[PDB]
Design a protein around this ligand. Structure first.
Ligand code: EDT
Ligand code: MG
Ligand code: MG
Length: 185
Protein backbone atom coordinates (compact mmCIF):
# COMPACT_ATOMS: atom_id res chain seq x y z
CA UNK A 1 0.00 0.00 0.00
CA UNK A 2 0.92 3.71 -0.14
CA UNK A 3 3.46 5.14 2.31
CA UNK A 4 5.09 8.51 3.01
CA UNK A 5 8.69 8.04 4.15
CA UNK A 6 11.14 10.73 5.22
CA UNK A 7 14.78 9.85 5.92
CA UNK A 8 16.86 11.80 8.44
CA UNK A 9 20.64 11.71 7.89
CA UNK A 10 23.64 13.06 9.79
CA UNK A 11 25.58 15.10 7.22
CA UNK A 12 28.69 17.15 7.99
CA UNK A 13 32.27 17.52 6.79
CA UNK A 14 33.25 15.18 9.63
CA UNK A 15 31.34 12.18 8.23
CA UNK A 16 31.71 13.04 4.54
CA UNK A 17 34.05 10.06 4.22
CA UNK A 18 31.06 7.76 4.82
CA UNK A 19 28.73 9.42 2.30
CA UNK A 20 29.17 6.70 -0.34
CA UNK A 21 28.49 3.87 2.08
CA UNK A 22 25.40 5.72 3.32
CA UNK A 23 24.26 6.32 -0.27
CA UNK A 24 24.28 2.57 -0.94
CA UNK A 25 22.32 2.06 2.29
CA UNK A 26 19.65 4.57 1.25
CA UNK A 27 19.33 2.99 -2.20
CA UNK A 28 18.40 -0.32 -0.60
CA UNK A 29 15.93 1.39 1.74
CA UNK A 30 14.30 3.28 -1.14
CA UNK A 31 14.05 0.04 -3.13
CA UNK A 32 12.37 -1.58 -0.11
CA UNK A 33 9.44 0.84 -0.50
CA UNK A 34 8.49 -0.46 -3.94
CA UNK A 35 7.29 1.70 -6.87
CA UNK A 36 7.29 5.47 -6.31
CA UNK A 37 4.11 7.32 -7.24
CA UNK A 38 1.24 9.56 -6.07
CA UNK A 39 -0.76 6.41 -5.27
CA UNK A 40 2.27 4.40 -4.16
CA UNK A 41 5.45 5.18 -2.19
CA UNK A 42 6.80 8.69 -1.62
CA UNK A 43 10.22 9.72 -0.30
CA UNK A 44 11.41 12.86 1.44
CA UNK A 45 14.80 13.71 2.91
CA UNK A 46 16.32 15.92 5.60
CA UNK A 47 19.91 16.08 6.81
CA UNK A 48 21.25 17.52 10.06
CA UNK A 49 24.39 19.00 11.53
CA UNK A 50 23.93 21.36 14.46
CA UNK A 51 21.10 22.66 12.27
CA UNK A 52 18.43 20.86 10.17
CA UNK A 53 18.45 20.94 6.35
CA UNK A 54 15.30 19.76 4.56
CA UNK A 55 16.48 18.70 1.09
CA UNK A 56 13.30 17.58 -0.67
CA UNK A 57 9.64 16.87 0.22
CA UNK A 58 7.55 13.73 -0.33
CA UNK A 59 6.20 14.94 -3.69
CA UNK A 60 9.41 16.46 -5.08
CA UNK A 61 9.55 13.63 -7.61
CA UNK A 62 8.33 10.10 -8.30
CA UNK A 63 11.16 9.58 -10.77
CA UNK A 64 13.51 7.11 -9.09
CA UNK A 65 16.44 8.28 -11.21
CA UNK A 66 16.04 11.87 -10.06
CA UNK A 67 15.53 10.90 -6.42
CA UNK A 68 18.75 8.88 -6.42
CA UNK A 69 20.65 11.80 -7.94
CA UNK A 70 19.35 14.05 -5.16
CA UNK A 71 20.62 11.50 -2.64
CA UNK A 72 23.93 11.37 -4.50
CA UNK A 73 24.26 15.16 -4.31
CA UNK A 74 23.54 15.46 -0.57
CA UNK A 75 25.72 18.30 0.74
CA UNK A 76 28.26 17.21 3.36
CA UNK A 77 29.49 20.77 3.96
CA UNK A 78 28.30 21.74 7.44
CA UNK A 79 30.54 22.18 10.50
CA UNK A 80 30.56 19.57 13.28
CA UNK A 81 27.23 18.97 15.01
CA UNK A 82 24.87 16.10 15.79
CA UNK A 83 21.53 17.65 16.74
CA UNK A 84 19.08 14.84 16.01
CA UNK A 85 16.44 16.39 18.26
CA UNK A 86 15.83 19.53 16.21
CA UNK A 87 16.06 17.47 13.02
CA UNK A 88 13.16 15.26 14.13
CA UNK A 89 11.09 18.34 15.00
CA UNK A 90 11.82 20.03 11.67
CA UNK A 91 11.13 16.90 9.62
CA UNK A 92 7.84 16.50 11.49
CA UNK A 93 6.71 20.11 11.13
CA UNK A 94 7.78 20.64 7.51
CA UNK A 95 7.87 17.21 5.79
CA UNK A 96 5.56 14.74 7.59
CA UNK A 97 2.86 17.01 9.05
CA UNK A 98 -0.62 16.84 7.53
CA UNK A 99 -0.03 20.24 5.90
CA UNK A 100 3.45 19.39 4.59
CA UNK A 101 4.15 19.26 0.82
CA UNK A 102 3.03 15.96 -0.70
CA UNK A 103 1.84 14.49 2.60
CA UNK A 104 -1.17 12.26 1.92
CA UNK A 105 -3.98 11.76 4.43
CA UNK A 106 -5.08 8.21 5.28
CA UNK A 107 -1.53 7.18 4.31
CA UNK A 108 1.00 5.91 6.87
CA UNK A 109 3.83 8.35 7.58
CA UNK A 110 7.28 7.02 8.50
CA UNK A 111 10.34 8.79 9.86
CA UNK A 112 13.61 6.89 9.39
CA UNK A 113 16.56 8.01 11.52
CA UNK A 114 20.18 7.43 10.54
CA UNK A 115 22.63 7.94 13.42
CA UNK A 116 26.42 7.55 13.47
CA UNK A 117 27.54 9.42 16.60
CA UNK A 118 26.67 9.54 20.31
CA UNK A 119 23.64 11.81 20.64
CA UNK A 120 23.74 15.12 22.50
CA UNK A 121 20.72 17.12 23.64
CA UNK A 122 17.14 15.91 24.02
CA UNK A 123 15.74 13.45 21.48
CA UNK A 124 13.01 12.01 23.71
CA UNK A 125 10.59 14.92 23.42
CA UNK A 126 10.75 15.35 19.60
CA UNK A 127 10.43 11.59 18.98
CA UNK A 128 7.56 11.16 21.44
CA UNK A 129 5.67 14.04 19.81
CA UNK A 130 6.24 12.55 16.36
CA UNK A 131 4.82 9.25 17.58
CA UNK A 132 1.86 10.94 19.27
CA UNK A 133 0.98 12.72 16.03
CA UNK A 134 0.71 9.27 14.42
CA UNK A 135 4.08 8.84 12.72
CA UNK A 136 6.08 5.61 12.78
CA UNK A 137 9.66 6.18 13.90
CA UNK A 138 12.46 3.78 12.95
CA UNK A 139 16.20 4.13 13.52
CA UNK A 140 19.34 2.71 11.97
CA UNK A 141 22.34 3.17 14.24
CA UNK A 142 25.52 2.99 12.17
CA UNK A 143 29.03 2.21 13.41
CA UNK A 144 30.09 5.06 15.67
CA UNK A 145 26.67 5.48 17.26
CA UNK A 146 25.72 4.53 20.82
CA UNK A 147 23.26 1.65 20.25
CA UNK A 148 21.50 2.14 23.60
CA UNK A 149 20.44 5.78 23.24
CA UNK A 150 17.50 5.26 20.89
CA UNK A 151 16.46 2.13 22.80
CA UNK A 152 16.01 3.88 26.16
CA UNK A 153 13.27 6.37 25.25
CA UNK A 154 10.69 5.83 28.00
CA UNK A 155 6.82 7.19 24.50
CA UNK A 156 6.34 3.93 22.61
CA UNK A 157 9.26 1.64 21.66
CA UNK A 158 11.15 2.28 18.41
CA UNK A 159 12.16 -0.26 15.79
CA UNK A 160 15.93 -0.01 16.24
CA UNK A 161 18.65 -1.58 14.11
CA UNK A 162 22.35 -1.40 14.92
CA UNK A 163 25.29 -2.04 12.61
CA UNK A 164 27.97 -3.64 14.78
CA UNK A 165 30.45 -3.23 11.92
CA UNK A 166 30.64 -1.68 8.45
CA UNK A 167 30.54 -5.10 6.77
CA UNK A 168 28.13 -8.01 7.34
CA UNK A 169 26.94 -6.32 10.53
CA UNK A 170 25.86 -3.33 8.47
CA UNK A 171 24.27 -5.52 5.79
CA UNK A 172 22.13 -7.39 8.33
CA UNK A 173 20.92 -4.18 9.96
CA UNK A 174 19.98 -2.61 6.63
CA UNK A 175 18.19 -5.77 5.50
CA UNK A 176 16.22 -5.89 8.76
CA UNK A 177 15.21 -2.24 8.40
CA UNK A 178 14.29 -2.84 4.75
CA UNK A 179 11.89 -5.58 5.84
CA UNK A 180 10.52 -3.28 8.55
CA UNK A 181 9.83 -0.54 5.99
CA UNK A 182 7.99 -2.98 3.71
CA UNK A 183 5.68 -3.83 6.62
CA UNK A 184 5.02 -0.20 7.58
CA UNK A 185 2.64 0.24 4.65
O1 EDT B 1 17.91 12.44 -18.28
C1 EDT B 1 17.07 11.58 -18.63
O2 EDT B 1 17.14 11.02 -19.75
C2 EDT B 1 15.94 11.19 -17.71
N1 EDT B 1 16.01 11.89 -16.41
C3 EDT B 1 14.69 12.44 -16.08
C4 EDT B 1 16.35 10.97 -15.30
C5 EDT B 1 17.84 10.86 -14.99
O3 EDT B 1 18.61 11.67 -15.53
O4 EDT B 1 18.25 9.97 -14.22
MG1 MG C 1 17.90 13.34 -16.62
MG1 MG D 1 29.74 15.80 13.76
Amino acid sequence: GPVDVVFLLHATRDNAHNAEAVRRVLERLVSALGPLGPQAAQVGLLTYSHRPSPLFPLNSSHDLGIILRKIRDIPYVDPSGNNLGTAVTTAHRYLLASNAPGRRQQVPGVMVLLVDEPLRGDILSPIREAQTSGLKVMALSLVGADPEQLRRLATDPIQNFFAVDNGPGLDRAVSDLAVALCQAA
